[PDB]
Amino acid sequence: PELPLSTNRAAGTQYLAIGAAYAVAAGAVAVAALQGPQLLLASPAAADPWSSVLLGCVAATYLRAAGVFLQLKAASDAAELLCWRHQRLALTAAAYGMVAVLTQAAGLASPQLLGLQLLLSVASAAVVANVARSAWAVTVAGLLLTTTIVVSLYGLFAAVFAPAPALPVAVGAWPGTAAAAAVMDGSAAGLRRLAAGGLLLTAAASHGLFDFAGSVPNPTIYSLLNLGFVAAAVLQSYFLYIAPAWGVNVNWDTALWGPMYGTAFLGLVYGLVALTKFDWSSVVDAVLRVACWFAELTMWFWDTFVWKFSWSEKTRRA
Amino acid sequence: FSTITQPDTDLIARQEKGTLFWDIWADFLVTAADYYNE
Amino acid sequence: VVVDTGVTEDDRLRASLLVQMLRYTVPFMVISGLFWMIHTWILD
Amino acid sequence: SLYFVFTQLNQKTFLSYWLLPVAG
Amino acid sequence: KLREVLLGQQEAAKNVAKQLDEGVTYMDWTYRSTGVDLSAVWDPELWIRFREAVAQNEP
Amino acid sequence: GERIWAWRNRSENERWFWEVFAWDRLIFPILVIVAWEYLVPNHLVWAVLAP
Numbered sequence: 001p002e003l004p005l006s007t008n009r010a011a012g013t014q015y016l017a018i019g020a021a022y023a024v025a026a027g028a029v030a031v032a033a034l035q036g037p038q039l040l041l042a043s044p045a046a047a048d049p050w051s052s053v054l055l056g057c058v059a060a061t062y063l064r065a066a067g068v069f070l071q072l073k074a075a076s077d078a079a080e081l082l083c084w085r086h087q088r089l090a091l092t093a094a095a096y097g098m099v100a101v102l103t104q105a106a107g108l109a110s111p112q113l114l115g116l117q118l119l120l121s122v123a124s125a126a127v128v129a130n131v132a133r134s135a136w137a138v139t140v141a142g143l144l145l146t147t148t149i150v151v152s153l154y155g156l157f158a159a160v161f162a163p164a165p166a167l168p169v170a171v172g173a174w175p176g177t178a179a180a181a182a183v184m185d186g187s188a189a190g191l192r193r194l195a196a197g198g199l200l201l202t203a204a205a206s207h208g209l210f211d212f213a214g215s216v217p218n219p220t221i222y223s224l225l226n227l228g229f230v231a232a233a234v235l236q237s238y239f240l241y242i243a244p245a246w247g248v249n250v251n252w253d254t255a256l257w258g259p260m261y262g263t264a265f266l267g268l269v270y271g272l273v274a275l276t277k278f279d280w281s282s283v284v285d286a287v288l289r290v291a292c293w294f295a296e297l298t299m300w301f302w303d304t305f306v307w308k309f310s311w312s313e314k315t316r317r318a
Numbered sequence: 319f320s321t322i323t324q325p326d327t328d329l330i331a332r333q334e335k336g337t338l339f340w341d342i343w344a345d346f347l348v349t350a351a352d353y354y355n356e
Numbered sequence: 357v358v359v360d361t362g363v364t365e366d367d368r369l370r371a372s373l374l375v376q377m378l379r380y381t382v383p384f385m386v387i388s389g390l391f392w393m394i395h396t397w398i399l400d
Numbered sequence: 401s402l403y404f405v406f407t408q409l410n411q412k413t414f415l416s417y418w419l420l421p422v423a424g
Numbered sequence: 425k426l427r428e429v430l431l432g433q434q435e436a437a438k439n440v441a442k443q444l445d446e447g448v449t450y451m452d453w454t455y456r457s458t459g460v461d462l463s464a465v466w467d468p469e470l471w472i473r474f475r476e477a478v479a480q481n482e483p
Numbered sequence: 484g485e486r487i488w489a490w491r492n493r494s495e496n497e498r499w500f501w502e503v504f505a506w507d508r509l510i511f512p513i514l515v516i517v518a519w520e521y522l523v524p525n526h527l528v529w530a531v532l533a534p
Protein backbone atom coordinates (compact mmCIF):
# COMPACT_ATOMS: atom_id res chain seq x y z
CA PRO A 1 0.00 0.00 0.00
CA GLU A 2 2.88 2.35 -0.84
CA LEU A 3 2.46 5.82 -2.36
CA PRO A 4 3.50 5.88 -6.05
CA LEU A 5 4.74 8.92 -7.96
CA SER A 6 1.19 10.19 -8.61
CA THR A 7 0.11 11.32 -5.14
CA ASN A 8 3.71 12.16 -4.23
CA ARG A 9 4.21 14.57 -7.14
CA ALA A 10 0.70 16.02 -6.78
CA ALA A 11 1.30 16.70 -3.09
CA GLY A 12 4.72 18.18 -3.81
CA THR A 13 3.35 20.58 -6.42
CA GLN A 14 0.48 21.56 -4.10
CA TYR A 15 2.95 22.22 -1.28
CA LEU A 16 5.43 24.30 -3.29
CA ALA A 17 2.62 26.34 -4.86
CA ILE A 18 0.71 27.20 -1.69
CA GLY A 19 3.97 27.77 0.20
CA ALA A 20 5.30 30.21 -2.38
CA ALA A 21 1.95 32.01 -2.15
CA TYR A 22 2.19 32.19 1.65
CA ALA A 23 5.81 33.40 1.48
CA VAL A 24 5.31 36.22 -1.00
CA ALA A 25 2.11 37.24 0.81
CA ALA A 26 4.09 37.30 4.06
CA GLY A 27 6.67 39.67 2.59
CA ALA A 28 3.81 41.77 1.21
CA VAL A 29 2.02 41.99 4.55
CA ALA A 30 5.36 42.86 6.15
CA VAL A 31 5.75 45.92 3.95
CA ALA A 32 2.02 46.59 4.52
CA ALA A 33 2.58 46.59 8.29
CA LEU A 34 5.36 49.05 7.55
CA GLN A 35 2.75 51.11 5.69
CA GLY A 36 -0.31 50.84 7.93
CA PRO A 37 -3.31 48.81 9.10
CA GLN A 38 -5.63 50.45 6.57
CA LEU A 39 -3.73 48.45 3.93
CA LEU A 40 -6.07 45.43 4.09
CA LEU A 41 -8.90 46.09 6.57
CA ALA A 42 -11.80 48.55 6.67
CA SER A 43 -12.09 49.30 10.40
CA PRO A 44 -11.77 53.09 10.86
CA ALA A 45 -10.26 52.67 14.35
CA ALA A 46 -6.85 51.83 12.84
CA ALA A 47 -4.88 54.99 13.76
CA ASP A 48 -2.70 53.25 16.37
CA PRO A 49 0.79 51.70 16.17
CA TRP A 50 -0.41 48.61 18.07
CA SER A 51 -2.16 47.42 14.92
CA SER A 52 1.13 48.05 13.09
CA VAL A 53 3.22 45.93 15.46
CA LEU A 54 0.53 43.25 15.56
CA LEU A 55 0.80 43.20 11.74
CA GLY A 56 4.57 42.87 11.97
CA CYS A 57 3.93 39.75 14.03
CA VAL A 58 1.47 38.61 11.34
CA ALA A 59 4.23 39.05 8.76
CA ALA A 60 6.81 37.04 10.69
CA THR A 61 4.30 34.27 11.35
CA TYR A 62 3.24 33.97 7.71
CA LEU A 63 6.94 33.71 6.95
CA ARG A 64 6.89 30.81 9.40
CA ALA A 65 3.94 29.28 7.54
CA ALA A 66 5.98 29.47 4.34
CA GLY A 67 8.77 27.69 6.17
CA VAL A 68 6.29 25.01 7.25
CA PHE A 69 5.16 24.30 3.70
CA LEU A 70 8.74 24.20 2.42
CA GLN A 71 9.41 21.74 5.25
CA LEU A 72 6.59 19.53 4.00
CA LYS A 73 8.02 19.93 0.49
CA ALA A 74 11.43 18.64 1.56
CA ALA A 75 9.85 15.92 3.73
CA SER A 76 7.29 14.32 1.39
CA ASP A 77 9.71 14.36 -1.57
CA ALA A 78 11.01 11.01 -0.32
CA ALA A 79 7.35 9.94 0.01
CA GLU A 80 7.44 10.20 3.80
CA LEU A 81 3.66 10.43 4.20
CA LEU A 82 3.58 6.85 5.49
CA CYS A 83 4.84 7.23 9.06
CA TRP A 84 2.20 8.19 11.61
CA ARG A 85 4.12 11.34 12.57
CA HIS A 86 3.47 12.94 9.19
CA GLN A 87 -0.18 11.97 9.68
CA ARG A 88 0.01 13.85 12.98
CA LEU A 89 1.44 16.88 11.15
CA ALA A 90 -1.32 16.74 8.54
CA LEU A 91 -4.18 16.32 11.01
CA THR A 92 -2.87 19.24 13.07
CA ALA A 93 -2.63 21.29 9.87
CA ALA A 94 -6.31 20.44 9.41
CA ALA A 95 -7.04 21.50 12.99
CA TYR A 96 -5.42 24.83 12.14
CA GLY A 97 -8.19 25.46 9.62
CA MET A 98 -10.81 23.92 11.90
CA VAL A 99 -10.16 26.26 14.84
CA ALA A 100 -9.55 29.19 12.48
CA VAL A 101 -12.88 28.90 10.68
CA LEU A 102 -14.92 28.09 13.80
CA THR A 103 -13.42 31.15 15.47
CA GLN A 104 -14.15 33.22 12.36
CA ALA A 105 -17.75 32.16 12.93
CA ALA A 106 -17.07 33.27 16.51
CA GLY A 107 -15.77 36.57 15.11
CA LEU A 108 -14.60 38.35 11.96
CA ALA A 109 -12.74 41.64 11.47
CA SER A 110 -12.82 42.50 7.76
CA PRO A 111 -13.91 40.64 4.62
CA GLN A 112 -10.30 40.17 3.47
CA LEU A 113 -9.49 38.49 6.80
CA LEU A 114 -11.85 35.60 6.08
CA GLY A 115 -10.79 35.91 2.44
CA LEU A 116 -7.13 35.01 2.93
CA GLN A 117 -7.75 32.78 5.95
CA LEU A 118 -10.54 30.63 4.50
CA LEU A 119 -8.72 30.61 1.14
CA LEU A 120 -5.68 28.80 2.44
CA SER A 121 -7.66 26.99 5.16
CA VAL A 122 -9.92 25.41 2.52
CA ALA A 123 -6.81 24.58 0.52
CA SER A 124 -5.53 22.73 3.60
CA ALA A 125 -8.91 21.14 4.31
CA ALA A 126 -9.23 19.69 0.81
CA VAL A 127 -5.65 18.44 0.58
CA VAL A 128 -5.44 16.89 4.05
CA ALA A 129 -8.95 15.41 3.90
CA ASN A 130 -8.55 13.66 0.56
CA VAL A 131 -4.93 12.59 1.12
CA ALA A 132 -5.76 11.27 4.61
CA ARG A 133 -8.66 9.35 3.10
CA SER A 134 -6.13 7.86 0.68
CA ALA A 135 -3.71 7.14 3.54
CA TRP A 136 -6.54 5.37 5.40
CA ALA A 137 -6.27 2.67 2.70
CA VAL A 138 -2.47 2.47 3.11
CA THR A 139 17.03 17.45 25.90
CA VAL A 140 17.92 21.15 25.88
CA ALA A 141 16.71 22.07 22.39
CA GLY A 142 13.89 19.62 23.02
CA LEU A 143 13.07 21.52 26.20
CA LEU A 144 12.94 24.81 24.29
CA LEU A 145 10.71 23.38 21.57
CA THR A 146 8.40 21.74 24.12
CA THR A 147 7.98 24.98 26.03
CA THR A 148 7.37 26.78 22.73
CA ILE A 149 4.54 24.45 21.73
CA VAL A 150 2.91 24.64 25.15
CA VAL A 151 3.24 28.43 25.45
CA SER A 152 1.63 28.93 22.05
CA LEU A 153 -1.06 26.36 22.88
CA TYR A 154 -1.85 28.39 25.99
CA GLY A 155 -1.88 31.65 24.04
CA LEU A 156 -4.52 30.33 21.66
CA PHE A 157 -6.60 28.35 24.16
CA ALA A 158 -6.83 31.51 26.27
CA ALA A 159 -7.30 34.13 23.54
CA VAL A 160 -10.19 32.69 21.49
CA PHE A 161 -12.08 30.47 23.96
CA ALA A 162 -13.08 33.76 25.71
CA PRO A 163 -14.95 36.53 23.86
CA ALA A 164 -12.74 39.61 24.31
CA PRO A 165 -10.95 41.80 26.90
CA ALA A 166 -11.97 45.23 28.20
CA LEU A 167 -9.54 48.14 28.20
CA PRO A 168 -8.73 50.14 31.35
CA VAL A 169 -11.36 52.78 32.04
CA ALA A 170 -9.13 55.53 33.50
CA VAL A 171 -12.05 57.42 35.02
CA GLY A 172 -12.04 61.09 34.08
CA ALA A 173 -10.11 60.82 30.80
CA TRP A 174 -11.34 63.71 28.62
CA PRO A 175 -15.10 63.03 28.70
CA GLY A 176 -15.26 63.85 25.00
CA THR A 177 -13.99 61.72 22.13
CA ALA A 178 -10.54 60.17 21.35
CA ALA A 179 -11.76 56.85 22.80
CA ALA A 180 -10.57 57.72 26.31
CA ALA A 181 -12.62 55.75 28.85
CA ALA A 182 -14.26 53.57 26.21
CA VAL A 183 -14.54 49.88 25.13
CA MET A 184 -12.82 48.11 22.15
CA ASP A 185 -13.76 47.63 18.46
CA GLY A 186 -13.68 45.60 15.22
CA SER A 187 -10.18 46.70 14.14
CA ALA A 188 -8.61 45.73 17.48
CA ALA A 189 -10.52 42.45 17.90
CA GLY A 190 -9.77 41.06 14.40
CA LEU A 191 -6.21 42.29 14.04
CA ARG A 192 -5.59 40.44 17.36
CA ARG A 193 -7.50 37.29 16.27
CA LEU A 194 -4.84 37.30 13.48
CA ALA A 195 -1.73 37.41 15.78
CA ALA A 196 -3.24 34.34 17.48
CA GLY A 197 -3.17 32.52 14.15
CA GLY A 198 0.44 33.50 13.57
CA LEU A 199 1.51 32.07 16.90
CA LEU A 200 -0.55 28.99 16.00
CA LEU A 201 1.42 28.56 12.79
CA THR A 202 4.73 28.68 14.63
CA ALA A 203 3.23 26.40 17.31
CA ALA A 204 2.49 23.76 14.68
CA ALA A 205 5.91 24.21 13.10
CA SER A 206 7.52 23.65 16.49
CA HIS A 207 5.39 20.62 17.44
CA GLY A 208 6.29 19.13 14.08
CA LEU A 209 10.00 19.77 14.57
CA PHE A 210 9.91 18.40 18.12
CA ASP A 211 7.98 15.20 17.40
CA PHE A 212 10.05 14.66 14.23
CA ALA A 213 13.65 15.49 15.20
CA GLY A 214 13.20 14.39 18.82
CA SER A 215 15.88 11.84 17.92
CA VAL A 216 18.41 14.68 17.51
CA PRO A 217 13.98 11.22 8.95
CA ASN A 218 17.38 12.78 8.22
CA PRO A 219 18.20 15.27 10.99
CA THR A 220 20.16 17.91 9.08
CA ILE A 221 18.42 19.36 6.00
CA TYR A 222 15.77 20.63 8.43
CA SER A 223 18.24 23.52 8.19
CA LEU A 224 15.65 24.91 5.77
CA LEU A 225 12.87 25.07 8.37
CA ASN A 226 15.41 26.25 10.94
CA LEU A 227 15.90 29.51 9.04
CA GLY A 228 12.14 29.94 8.81
CA PHE A 229 11.98 29.49 12.58
CA VAL A 230 14.86 31.83 13.43
CA ALA A 231 14.86 34.68 10.89
CA ALA A 232 11.22 35.63 11.43
CA ALA A 233 11.75 35.32 15.17
CA VAL A 234 14.60 37.81 15.43
CA LEU A 235 12.93 40.40 13.23
CA GLN A 236 9.78 40.06 15.33
CA SER A 237 11.84 40.73 18.44
CA TYR A 238 13.30 43.79 16.73
CA PHE A 239 9.91 45.48 16.46
CA LEU A 240 9.10 44.52 20.03
CA TYR A 241 12.45 45.89 21.21
CA ILE A 242 11.33 49.29 19.86
CA ALA A 243 7.64 49.05 20.80
CA PRO A 244 8.34 51.27 23.86
CA ALA A 245 9.85 53.93 21.59
CA TRP A 246 6.84 53.57 19.28
CA GLY A 247 4.60 54.74 22.12
CA VAL A 248 2.57 51.52 22.47
CA ASN A 249 0.94 50.10 25.60
CA VAL A 250 2.12 46.49 25.64
CA ASN A 251 1.74 45.94 29.39
CA TRP A 252 -1.97 46.28 30.18
CA ASP A 253 -3.00 43.16 28.23
CA THR A 254 -1.02 40.02 29.03
CA ALA A 255 -3.20 37.66 26.97
CA LEU A 256 -1.67 38.90 23.70
CA TRP A 257 1.86 40.28 24.14
CA GLY A 258 3.04 37.60 26.55
CA PRO A 259 3.12 34.75 24.04
CA MET A 260 4.69 36.99 21.38
CA TYR A 261 7.55 38.17 23.61
CA GLY A 262 8.12 34.73 25.11
CA THR A 263 8.15 33.01 21.74
CA ALA A 264 10.52 35.59 20.27
CA PHE A 265 12.91 35.08 23.18
CA LEU A 266 12.60 31.30 22.92
CA GLY A 267 13.29 31.28 19.20
CA LEU A 268 16.29 33.56 19.59
CA VAL A 269 17.84 31.47 22.36
CA TYR A 270 17.10 28.37 20.28
CA GLY A 271 19.05 29.84 17.39
CA LEU A 272 21.88 30.66 19.78
CA VAL A 273 22.01 27.17 21.30
CA ALA A 274 21.87 25.59 17.84
CA LEU A 275 24.85 27.73 16.80
CA THR A 276 27.07 26.29 19.56
CA LYS A 277 25.35 22.96 20.37
CA PHE A 278 24.77 22.89 24.10
CA ASP A 279 24.81 19.12 24.53
CA TRP A 280 22.51 19.08 27.62
CA SER A 281 25.55 17.72 29.46
CA SER A 282 27.70 20.85 29.18
CA VAL A 283 25.64 22.48 31.92
CA VAL A 284 26.87 19.59 34.07
CA ASP A 285 30.44 20.59 33.29
CA ALA A 286 29.65 24.22 34.12
CA VAL A 287 28.15 23.39 37.51
CA LEU A 288 31.02 21.02 38.23
CA ARG A 289 33.51 23.78 37.46
CA VAL A 290 31.84 26.27 39.78
CA ALA A 291 31.51 23.63 42.50
CA CYS A 292 35.18 22.70 42.17
CA TRP A 293 36.10 26.36 42.53
CA PHE A 294 33.98 26.84 45.64
CA ALA A 295 35.38 23.64 47.12
CA GLU A 296 38.88 24.99 46.56
CA LEU A 297 37.72 28.16 48.30
CA THR A 298 36.22 26.55 51.40
CA MET A 299 39.23 24.27 51.82
CA TRP A 300 41.55 27.27 51.96
CA PHE A 301 39.19 29.09 54.32
CA TRP A 302 38.92 26.10 56.66
CA ASP A 303 42.65 25.47 56.75
CA THR A 304 43.51 29.13 57.29
CA PHE A 305 40.87 30.40 59.73
CA VAL A 306 39.14 27.50 61.47
CA TRP A 307 41.35 24.49 62.16
CA LYS A 308 44.49 23.38 60.37
CA PHE A 309 44.28 20.26 58.24
CA SER A 310 47.46 18.91 59.78
CA TRP A 311 45.79 19.00 63.20
CA SER A 312 42.42 17.41 62.53
CA GLU A 313 43.64 14.54 60.36
CA LYS A 314 45.48 11.53 61.74
CA THR A 315 49.20 11.00 61.24
CA ARG A 316 50.73 7.59 60.58
CA ARG A 317 53.83 5.67 61.71
CA ALA A 318 53.55 6.15 65.51
CA PHE B 319 43.80 7.20 73.48
CA SER B 320 44.53 7.15 69.76
CA THR B 321 44.86 10.93 69.64
CA ILE B 322 47.43 11.50 72.39
CA THR B 323 49.68 8.71 71.12
CA GLN B 324 50.40 10.28 67.75
CA PRO B 325 53.96 11.42 66.99
CA ASP B 326 54.67 14.91 68.27
CA THR B 327 56.51 17.67 66.40
CA ASP B 328 59.96 16.12 66.78
CA LEU B 329 59.05 12.82 65.14
CA ILE B 330 57.02 14.46 62.36
CA ALA B 331 59.92 16.75 61.50
CA ARG B 332 62.29 13.78 61.59
CA GLN B 333 60.04 11.94 59.14
CA GLU B 334 59.92 14.89 56.74
CA LYS B 335 63.69 15.41 56.86
CA GLY B 336 64.32 11.69 56.42
CA THR B 337 62.15 11.55 53.31
CA LEU B 338 63.91 14.61 51.93
CA PHE B 339 67.35 13.12 52.53
CA TRP B 340 66.63 9.48 51.65
CA ASP B 341 63.59 9.30 49.40
CA ILE B 342 65.07 11.58 46.73
CA TRP B 343 68.68 12.36 47.54
CA ALA B 344 69.71 8.78 48.30
CA ASP B 345 68.35 7.04 45.21
CA PHE B 346 69.48 9.90 42.97
CA LEU B 347 73.11 9.62 44.05
CA VAL B 348 72.65 5.85 43.78
CA THR B 349 71.82 6.35 40.10
CA ALA B 350 74.83 8.65 39.78
CA ALA B 351 77.03 6.01 41.44
CA ASP B 352 75.95 3.27 39.04
CA TYR B 353 76.54 5.68 36.15
CA TYR B 354 80.02 6.30 37.59
CA ASN B 355 80.95 2.89 38.99
CA GLU B 356 86.79 4.69 50.90
CA VAL C 357 20.86 66.22 63.00
CA VAL C 358 20.99 63.46 60.40
CA VAL C 359 20.56 60.45 62.69
CA ASP C 360 21.44 57.19 60.97
CA THR C 361 21.19 53.58 62.10
CA GLY C 362 22.50 50.25 60.86
CA VAL C 363 20.95 47.17 59.30
CA THR C 364 20.22 45.26 62.57
CA GLU C 365 19.56 41.59 61.74
CA ASP C 366 16.55 40.06 63.62
CA ASP C 367 17.97 36.57 64.32
CA ARG C 368 20.76 37.44 66.81
CA LEU C 369 21.72 33.74 67.02
CA ARG C 370 22.10 32.78 63.33
CA ALA C 371 23.74 36.18 62.65
CA SER C 372 26.39 35.70 65.35
CA LEU C 373 27.39 32.03 65.06
CA LEU C 374 29.98 31.99 62.29
CA VAL C 375 31.72 35.06 63.70
CA GLN C 376 31.76 33.57 67.20
CA MET C 377 33.26 30.34 65.90
CA LEU C 378 35.98 32.51 64.39
CA ARG C 379 36.49 34.41 67.65
CA TYR C 380 37.22 31.09 69.31
CA THR C 381 39.36 29.47 66.62
CA VAL C 382 41.59 32.33 65.40
CA PRO C 383 43.80 32.71 68.52
CA PHE C 384 45.31 29.27 68.02
CA MET C 385 46.04 30.21 64.41
CA VAL C 386 47.80 33.40 65.52
CA ILE C 387 49.92 31.60 68.11
CA SER C 388 50.92 28.85 65.70
CA GLY C 389 51.77 31.34 62.96
CA LEU C 390 53.95 33.43 65.27
CA PHE C 391 55.95 30.50 66.59
CA TRP C 392 56.19 29.08 63.07
CA MET C 393 57.71 32.32 61.85
CA ILE C 394 60.34 32.12 64.57
CA HIS C 395 61.32 28.46 64.45
CA THR C 396 60.99 27.73 60.74
CA TRP C 397 60.95 30.85 58.59
CA ILE C 398 64.28 31.78 60.19
CA LEU C 399 65.66 28.43 61.39
CA ASP C 400 64.92 26.92 57.98
CA SER D 401 26.31 -3.13 42.66
CA LEU D 402 26.29 -1.25 45.96
CA TYR D 403 23.49 -0.74 48.45
CA PHE D 404 21.87 2.55 49.47
CA VAL D 405 23.82 3.33 52.63
CA PHE D 406 25.83 6.19 54.07
CA THR D 407 29.60 6.13 54.44
CA GLN D 408 31.46 6.22 57.72
CA LEU D 409 32.37 9.93 57.87
CA ASN D 410 34.59 9.70 60.95
CA GLN D 411 37.50 7.51 59.85
CA LYS D 412 39.56 10.60 59.01
CA THR D 413 38.95 13.24 61.68
CA PHE D 414 36.93 14.02 64.80
CA LEU D 415 35.70 17.54 64.02
CA SER D 416 32.20 16.39 63.17
CA TYR D 417 31.36 15.75 66.82
CA TRP D 418 31.62 19.50 67.40
CA LEU D 419 28.16 19.88 65.91
CA LEU D 420 26.32 17.64 68.30
CA PRO D 421 26.75 19.72 71.48
CA VAL D 422 26.52 23.09 69.73
CA ALA D 423 23.24 22.29 67.99
CA GLY D 424 21.98 20.75 71.20
CA LYS E 425 44.08 55.58 29.65
CA LEU E 426 41.93 55.74 32.78
CA ARG E 427 42.60 59.41 33.59
CA GLU E 428 40.19 60.80 31.00
CA VAL E 429 37.62 58.07 31.71
CA LEU E 430 37.66 59.09 35.38
CA LEU E 431 37.69 62.83 34.67
CA GLY E 432 34.62 62.42 32.47
CA GLN E 433 32.07 61.39 35.09
CA GLN E 434 33.28 63.35 38.14
CA GLU E 435 29.92 62.73 39.82
CA ALA E 436 29.45 58.96 39.81
CA ALA E 437 33.18 58.80 40.55
CA LYS E 438 32.42 60.74 43.75
CA ASN E 439 29.26 58.77 44.56
CA VAL E 440 30.84 55.32 44.29
CA ALA E 441 33.85 56.51 46.30
CA LYS E 442 31.56 57.80 49.05
CA GLN E 443 29.56 54.56 49.14
CA LEU E 444 32.67 52.38 49.08
CA ASP E 445 34.32 54.33 51.91
CA GLU E 446 31.22 54.39 54.10
CA GLY E 447 30.75 50.69 53.47
CA VAL E 448 34.28 49.70 54.35
CA THR E 449 34.14 51.88 57.48
CA TYR E 450 31.24 49.99 59.09
CA MET E 451 31.28 46.50 57.63
CA ASP E 452 27.50 46.12 58.02
CA TRP E 453 26.82 44.77 54.53
CA THR E 454 28.66 41.57 55.35
CA TYR E 455 25.95 39.37 56.80
CA ARG E 456 23.46 39.56 53.94
CA SER E 457 26.20 39.10 51.34
CA THR E 458 28.60 36.52 52.84
CA GLY E 459 26.91 35.05 55.92
CA VAL E 460 29.66 36.09 58.35
CA ASP E 461 28.68 39.19 60.34
CA LEU E 462 31.96 41.06 60.42
CA SER E 463 30.46 44.09 62.15
CA ALA E 464 30.94 42.44 65.54
CA VAL E 465 34.76 42.39 65.43
CA TRP E 466 35.34 45.48 63.31
CA ASP E 467 36.48 48.78 64.81
CA PRO E 468 35.30 51.81 62.83
CA GLU E 469 37.35 54.20 64.94
CA LEU E 470 40.64 52.47 64.17
CA TRP E 471 39.85 52.53 60.46
CA ILE E 472 38.94 56.21 60.54
CA ARG E 473 42.18 56.99 62.36
CA PHE E 474 44.17 54.94 59.85
CA ARG E 475 42.54 56.87 57.01
CA GLU E 476 43.27 60.27 58.54
CA ALA E 477 46.82 59.27 59.47
CA VAL E 478 47.73 58.28 55.93
CA ALA E 479 45.94 61.38 54.65
CA GLN E 480 48.02 63.72 56.83
CA ASN E 481 51.19 61.58 57.02
CA GLU E 482 51.30 61.56 60.82
CA PRO E 483 51.76 58.02 62.16
CA GLY F 484 27.97 -20.79 79.03
CA GLU F 485 26.12 -23.17 76.74
CA ARG F 486 23.21 -20.75 76.44
CA ILE F 487 25.56 -17.93 75.47
CA TRP F 488 27.23 -20.12 72.85
CA ALA F 489 23.89 -21.02 71.30
CA TRP F 490 22.75 -17.39 71.27
CA ARG F 491 25.97 -16.15 69.72
CA ASN F 492 25.73 -18.57 66.84
CA ARG F 493 22.24 -17.30 65.93
CA SER F 494 22.84 -13.55 66.18
CA GLU F 495 25.70 -12.57 63.91
CA ASN F 496 23.87 -10.09 61.68
CA GLU F 497 22.40 -8.21 64.62
CA ARG F 498 25.72 -8.19 66.41
CA TRP F 499 27.45 -6.59 63.46
CA PHE F 500 24.59 -4.13 63.04
CA TRP F 501 24.70 -2.93 66.62
CA GLU F 502 28.49 -2.86 66.77
CA VAL F 503 29.63 -1.43 63.44
CA PHE F 504 26.66 0.03 61.61
CA ALA F 505 24.08 1.58 63.92
CA TRP F 506 25.87 4.75 64.99
CA ASP F 507 28.69 5.17 62.52
CA ARG F 508 26.72 4.76 59.30
CA LEU F 509 23.07 5.37 60.20
CA ILE F 510 22.57 7.85 63.05
CA PHE F 511 25.72 9.95 63.00
CA PRO F 512 25.47 11.21 59.39
CA ILE F 513 21.78 12.01 59.75
CA LEU F 514 22.36 13.92 62.97
CA VAL F 515 25.37 15.71 61.48
CA ILE F 516 23.56 16.92 58.38
CA VAL F 517 20.42 17.98 60.23
CA ALA F 518 22.48 19.82 62.86
CA TRP F 519 24.60 21.60 60.26
CA GLU F 520 21.50 22.77 58.43
CA TYR F 521 19.90 23.96 61.67
CA LEU F 522 22.70 26.50 62.23
CA VAL F 523 24.36 28.05 59.18
CA PRO F 524 22.22 30.85 57.65
CA ASN F 525 19.99 30.47 54.58
CA HIS F 526 22.71 31.25 52.08
CA LEU F 527 23.80 29.03 49.21
CA VAL F 528 27.53 28.87 49.88
CA TRP F 529 26.57 27.66 53.35
CA ALA F 530 23.50 25.52 52.70
CA VAL F 531 24.75 23.46 49.75
CA LEU F 532 28.22 24.30 48.48
CA ALA F 533 30.36 24.14 51.62
CA PRO F 534 28.77 20.95 52.97
Ligand SMILES: CC(C)CCC[C@@H](C)[C@H]1CC[C@H]2[C@@H]3CC=C4C[C@@H](OC(=O)CCC(=O)O)CC[C@]4(C)[C@H]3CC[C@]12C
Binds near residue numbers: 403404405
Ligand atom coordinates in the same frame (compact mmCIF):
# COMPACT_ATOMS: atom_id res chain seq x y z
C1 LIG G 1 17.26 -1.17 64.98
C2 LIG G 1 15.89 -0.71 64.51
C3 LIG G 1 15.47 0.52 65.29
C4 LIG G 1 15.87 -0.46 63.01
C5 LIG G 1 16.66 -1.45 62.18
C6 LIG G 1 17.35 -0.81 61.02
C7 LIG G 1 18.11 -1.77 60.09
C8 LIG G 1 17.64 -3.20 60.33
C9 LIG G 1 17.96 -1.30 58.64
C10 LIG G 1 17.96 0.25 58.55
C11 LIG G 1 18.77 0.64 57.30
C12 LIG G 1 18.74 -0.66 56.50
C13 LIG G 1 19.56 -0.77 55.23
C14 LIG G 1 19.25 0.40 54.30
C15 LIG G 1 19.59 0.13 52.87
C16 LIG G 1 19.70 -1.08 52.33
C17 LIG G 1 19.76 -1.26 50.83
C18 LIG G 1 18.69 -2.20 50.33
O1 LIG G 1 19.37 -3.24 49.57
C19 LIG G 1 18.62 -4.09 48.87
O2 LIG G 1 17.90 -3.75 47.98
C20 LIG G 1 18.79 -5.50 49.32
C21 LIG G 1 17.79 -6.50 48.78
C22 LIG G 1 18.38 -7.51 47.82
O3 LIG G 1 18.45 -7.19 46.61
O4 LIG G 1 18.78 -8.60 48.27
C23 LIG G 1 17.97 -2.85 51.47
C24 LIG G 1 18.97 -3.43 52.47
C25 LIG G 1 19.80 -2.34 53.17
C26 LIG G 1 21.28 -2.76 53.23
C27 LIG G 1 19.19 -2.11 54.58
C28 LIG G 1 19.48 -3.26 55.56
C29 LIG G 1 18.74 -3.10 56.89
C30 LIG G 1 18.99 -1.74 57.56
C31 LIG G 1 20.42 -1.67 58.12
